[PDB]
Amino acid sequence: SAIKPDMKIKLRMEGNVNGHHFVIDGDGTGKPFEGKQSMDLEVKEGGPLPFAFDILTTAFNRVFAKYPDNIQDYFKQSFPKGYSWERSLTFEDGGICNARNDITMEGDTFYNKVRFYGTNFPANGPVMQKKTLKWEPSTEKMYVRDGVLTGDVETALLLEGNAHYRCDFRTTYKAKEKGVKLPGAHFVDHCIEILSHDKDYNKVKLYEHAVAHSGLP
């Protein structure tokens, strides 16, 4: 196994939401086999961010997910050469964006080159007004569509005042190494939370727990 039980995470995201440019650095640690990761995020440029930090978090690696023996782990088989993903998020009020991550490994460290582009968010909407509280736990459906590993998520952000703001993600995953065998369809349950933050989310501690299953208990 190229992958150790304890892997470090290095991350730089360059992005633009509704015109606003920003650069965010990440430094964290994770247990790939337990499906757990936590990282410290620091806004390096464009702060304070004039939009809800929460729309970024899922962009801050499915290599951190507990896979049972009876599902093919595409992600952990992708290393050490690594893999990329591209994602389109579609929000109920027209807000759309495209995120990509190119993931590489060097010794005990995953390096992440992340790009995040958002547009069409209404000025009076929960994202530009900063009314989001968190992502609800989600289930990512994994399947193959025209020879590409694809994940669909129908989810929501909890808003101030008991309301939800609906998310549809579609992610395409591609190993750098030709002939990493595609897995069979399956599910990944996700648990993403902001553990701590300063006043304007210039510094954020992020945690994710993910588990792969066939649908049964």
Author numbering: 2 to 61, 65 to 221
Provide the publication's sentences verbatim:
In this study, we probed the light-induced reverse reaction, from the Trans to Cis chromophore conformation, initiated with 2 ms 405 nm pulses at a range of optical flash energy densities (0.1–6.7 mJ/mm2) after the initial Cis-to-Trans photoconversion had been driven to completion using ∼13 mW/mm2 of 473 nm CW illumination. A total of 435,200 images were obtained across 6 laser energy densities at 405 nm of 0, 0.1, 0.53, 1.78, 6.74, and 14.43 mJ/mm2. From these images, 79,976 single-crystal indexed diffraction patterns were obtained and merged into 6 data sets for each corresponding laser energy density. Data below a value of 0.5 in Fourier shell correlation were discarded, leading to a uniform limit of 1.7 Å being applied to all data sets. The initial examination of the chromophore-omitted maps clearly shows increasing occupancy of the Cis state at higher energy densities. A clear difference in reaction yield can be seen even when comparing the lowest flash energies (0.00 and 0.10 mJ/mm2), where a difference of 3% population transfer is determined from the shift in the minima.
The system studied was a reversibly switchable fluorescent protein (rsFP) which is a representative of a class of proteins that undergo a reversible photolysis reaction from a highly fluorescent “on” state to a weakly fluorescence “off” state. The specific rsFP used, rsKiiro, is a mutant of Skylan-NS33 specifically developed for ultrafast time-resolved crystallographic studies due to its ability to form crystals that diffract to high resolution (∼1.1 Å for single-crystal cryo-MX), high photoswitching quantum yield (∼18% Trans-to-Cis in the crystal), and high protein expression yields.
